C-alpha cells in the first residue's frame, strides 16, 4: 500500500538520520576518511529517498488524494531545501572549507528538525 511505501520511506530517512549523526561526530574528531565515506553512503540514502517520496507523491496523484498531495508537495520541496544543503555541504568538504561545513550542516539539522511535523501529518493522510 501506499502507506506501508511510506513507512519504508520514513525507514531510509531514519537510517539517513543515523549515518548523519556519525558523520557529524567524526567531522568534530577531525576523521576525514570517515566523513568521506560517510557523505558517499548519505549521498546514496537522500538518492534513494527522494525516489520513493517521488513514486509516493505520483500514487497519491494517481489515487485523487488531493491532501497527500498537497502535505507531498510541501514536504519534497522541503526535501530538496535539504539535499541542497547536502550537496553545499559536500562541495565545502572537497574544498577544505571546514568554516562552510559547519554552518551548512547545522542548517541541514535544523531544516530536517523543522519537516518532521509535516513527515507525521504525511503518515495519516495516505
Ligand atoms: O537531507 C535531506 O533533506 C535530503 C538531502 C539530499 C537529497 C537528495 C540528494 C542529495 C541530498
Do not use: P
Not at 519504508?8 to 568534530?28: C, I, L, R, S
Not at 517521488?54 to 522541503?78: H, P, Q, S, Y
Not at 539535499?83 to 539539522?109: C, P, R, T
Amino acid at each position: 500500500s501506499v502507506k506501508s511505501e511510506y513507512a519504508e520511506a520514513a525507514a531510509v530517512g531514519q537510517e539517513a538520520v543515523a549515518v548523519f549523526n556519525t558523520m557529524k561526530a567524526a567531522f568534530q574528531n577531525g576523521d576525514k576518511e570517515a566523513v568521506a565515506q560517510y557523505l558517499a553512503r548519505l549521498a546514496s540514502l537522500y538518492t534513494r529517498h527522494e525516489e520513493l517520496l517521488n513514486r509516493i507523491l505520483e500514487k497519491a496523484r494517481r489515487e485523487g488524494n488531493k491532501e497527500a498531495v498537497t502535505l507531498m508537495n510541501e514536504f519534497t520541496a522541503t526535501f530538496q531545501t535539504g539535499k541542497s544543503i547536502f550537496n553545499a555541504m559536500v562541495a565545502a568538504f572537497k574544498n577544505g572549507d571546514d568554516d562552510s561545513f559547519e554552518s551548512y550542516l547545522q542548517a541541514l539539522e535544523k531544516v530536517t528538525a523543522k519537516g518532521e511535523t509535516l513527515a507525521d501529518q504525511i503518515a495519516k493522510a495516505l
